[PDB]
Amino acid sequence: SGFRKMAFPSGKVEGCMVQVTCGTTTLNGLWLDDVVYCPRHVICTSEDMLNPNYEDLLIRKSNHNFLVQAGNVQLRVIGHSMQNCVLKLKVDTANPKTPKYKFVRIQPGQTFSVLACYNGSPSGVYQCAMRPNFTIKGSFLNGSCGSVGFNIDYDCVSFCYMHHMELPTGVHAGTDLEGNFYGPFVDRQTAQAAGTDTTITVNVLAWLYAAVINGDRWFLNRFTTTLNDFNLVAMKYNYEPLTQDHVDILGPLSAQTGIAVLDMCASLKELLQNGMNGRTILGSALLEDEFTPFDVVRQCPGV
Amino acid sequence: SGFRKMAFPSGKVEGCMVQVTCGTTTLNGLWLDDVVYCPRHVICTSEDMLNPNYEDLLIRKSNHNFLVQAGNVQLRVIGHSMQNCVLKLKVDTANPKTPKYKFVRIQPGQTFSVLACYNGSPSGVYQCAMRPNFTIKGSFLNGSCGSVGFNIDYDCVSFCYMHHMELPTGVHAGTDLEGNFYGPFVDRQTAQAAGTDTTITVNVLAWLYAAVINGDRWFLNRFTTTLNDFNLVAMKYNYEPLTQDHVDILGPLSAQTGIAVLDMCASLKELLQNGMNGRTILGSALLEDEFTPFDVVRQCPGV
């Protein structure tokens, strides 16, 4: 038993991390087959980042201007191109450690593991949710650009995130592996607004189900509610509106615990209106929203 | 910036996990050099676990009764012995993926990464603290026995924990890699008391320092205190007593932030006496105690 925020084992991804240097900017790249992926602002000076013209800057870079280091061995760069906000460096050698992989663009509220890296070396691994405003609340210190977020399905690694930016508010922004930013953000050092950071309602619900399964039951109440009546409450508390698709994906959790999804919604409603009274749920003193229903089910073998 | 609970990259440990079967009991083993380490209760039936005589049970096992599977290939068992509560299976083949490693017995309040495994396959990775009562609050579902806890120092893996038991209260107990239990626990299915689960004061302090460094400053107060006067408060709230060694290890955090350790103690005292008033610190609505000072410093490059 027990329930923990848990990242996927990072070994398949560790073997793909490289160091990419252009001029005096060094960050992390991802080495899959004979292509190295990294943030295009590897080509920028600190002054360039205030307002860069990436096309003009890249014009002045040749293959030999990109230094790519996997551990201590050289990769020879035989080609480069810019796909949206990522650079694709063609190298002379296929990574022998390349796993089965796909590139995925994930949906807001979905979760993934981040392998925080520094200078091409993995430093740590932790679980992240893509917030509804398309930021993540990570731990990205200097030199962590190019670190990636991924999910693993048996032996297939789905890369979904590459770290690019910290916004002036201290949250983090980045792209999928085709270089398209999540959210309205740009790789420029300017003030950028994340909208309201609303709570991922379907995830809080799944986590309450996890709590019940693990024997935390105090918040279970005597009320039920309706979808619209809950959403009326959800909107006041900046909760994502709940939809019948969300109800559907909670079905197996509802079936295991015998608690109808709308009864759990009514318990959540009372928690939002009354607070938690200094109690905890699964060791937390607030409502956790970075576990998807799939995350919960992976840790509840009864489902 | 940002601050996250973060485990070490698990790749060096993934390559050492194997599946160990004896009779119809299957759990995880750790394959280092030509020896496989696993919980000795792999040899027990469910009925045996109520009150096992491990010596008598092992008498009836030969080398060929232990089935060891690394992925899909066989390991040939050429010897077995019982070191305290672990079995050491000598196999015919040195693991080619064996990293540099040591066996360490960790101190209460120290932290480590757990690679949760099932049937020899890594499932996830998360950070744990050894509680002062020598339990951990993990996520260990059926078949996770033998999963290990470790720390990594550049390229050296320090194994410190092997999972053995869930106590009837839902917390977890286990051994070091010489098979000596942490705490007073035994590998028998009986009621076993963990004492009072006190809070790791020095860790809460380090995490408050991390909060300051990350710009969470509201709880900083105008008071200072004394070691004995703080401990007087600590004891009432079941906090571990603070010692001059603890003050010493917080020194670099005190130096970076300019906040004397006893001023931070006074801020903590006010938090314990007044609560957090529905505010958060580093996104948490309670005081976190599973970050050591070393953990914090690894994520605060200014220290």
User: In sequence order, what DSSP letters do the residues of B61-76 get, joined into one string?
Assistant: --GGGEEEEETTEEE-
Q: Which of B22, B38, B41, B128 is catalytic?
A: B41
Six token digits for residue B56: 């008598």
Six token digits for residue B277: 């008033």
Residue B56 burial class via C-beta count within 10 angstroms: exposed 0-12, middle 13-18, buried 19 and up = exposed
- What lies within 8 Å, CB to CB, of A204 at 6+ separation is A239, A268, A287, A288, A289
Quickly count helices (H) and strands (E) in chain B.
Answer: 8, 13
Domain ranges of chain B: 11-175, 201-298
A contact set with B (CB within 8 A): 1-12, 14-15, 115-116, 122-126, 137-142, 166, 170-172, 214-215, 275, 278, 280, 283-286, 298-299, 301
Q: How far apart are CA A203 and CA A291, in angstroms?
A: 5
Q: From 1.10.10.10, 1.10.3720.10, 1.10.1840.10, 3.40.1210.10, which CATH number describes the A201-298 domain?
A: 1.10.1840.10
Six token digits for residue A129: 């949710």
Q: Is residue B41 annotated as a catalytic residue, yes or no?
A: yes
Q: Is residue A41 annotated as a catalytic residue, yes or no?
A: yes
Q: How many CB atoms lie within 10 A of CB A300?
A: 21
Q: How far apart are CA A272 and CA A286, in angstroms?
A: 10
Mutate to test the interface with A, among B14, B141, B154, B280 (most CBs of A within 10 A): B141
Fold match, A11-175 / A201-298: no
CA-based radius of gyration for chain A: 22
Q: Tell me the one-letter amino acid at A186.
A: V
Nearest to B285 among A126, A214, A285 (CB): A285
Six token digits for residue B207: 């995490």
Six token digits for residue A25: 């900017």
CA-based radius of gyration for chain B: 22
User: How many residues are listed for chain B in this entry?
Assistant: 303
Q: Residues B257, B250: contact at Cβ < 8 Å? A: no
Quickly count helices (H) and strands (E) in chain A.
Answer: 8, 13
Q: How far apart are CA B133 and CA B171, in angstroms?
A: 11
Q: Among candidates B62, B63, B17, which has minimal Cα distance to B36? A: B17
Q: How far apart are CA A282 and CA B106, in angstroms?
A: 26
DSSP structural state of residue B94: -
Which residues pair with residue A32 across a beta bridge? A35
A55: enclosing H helix or E strand: helix A54-59
Residue B47 burial class via C-beta count within 10 angstroms: exposed 0-12, middle 13-18, buried 19 and up = exposed
- What lies within 8 Å, CB to CB, of B166 at 6+ separation is A1, A2, B140, B172, B173
SS3 B261: helix
Q: Are strands B100-103 and B156-166 parallel, antiparallel or unpaired?
A: parallel
B152-174 in b/e form (b: 16+ CB < 10 A) is beeeebbbbbbbbbbbeeebbbb
Q: Tell me the one-letter amino acid at A115.
A: L
Mutate to test the interface with A, among B3, B8, B10, B199 (most CBs of A within 10 A): B10
Q: Tell me the one-letter amino acid at A278.
A: G
* B302, closest residue in chain A (CA to CA): A141
If you search the block for the tokens 């938090």, which residue do you land on? B271
- What lies within 8 Å, CB to CB, of B122 at 6+ separation is A9, A11, B10, B13, B14, B17, B115, B116
CA torsion angle B265 B267 B272 B277 (round to 10): -160
Q: Among candidates A43, A25, A49, which has minimal Cα distance to A190? A: A49
Q: Residues B285, B278: contact at Cβ < 8 Å? A: yes
Q: Residues A127, A10: contact at Cβ < 8 Å? A: no
DSSP structural state of residue A246: H
Q: Measure in Å the smallest separation between the Cα of B1 and chain A Cα atoms.
A: 5
Q: Residues A172, A137: contact at Cβ < 8 Å? A: yes
Q: Which fold has domain B11-175?
A: Thrombin, subunit H (2.40.10)
Q: Residues B229, B266: contact at Cβ < 8 Å? A: no
Six token digits for residue A299: 């840790």
B contact set with A (CB within 8 A): 1-12, 14-15, 115-116, 122-126, 137-142, 166, 170-172, 214-215, 275, 278, 280, 283-286, 298-299, 301
CB-CB neighbors (< 8 A) of A170 in chain B: 1-2, 214-215
Q: Residues A41, A145: contact at Cβ < 8 Å? A: yes
Q: Which of A128, A145, A160, A300 is catalytic?
A: A145
User: How many residues are listed for chain A in this entry?
Assistant: 303
DSSP structural state of residue A284: B
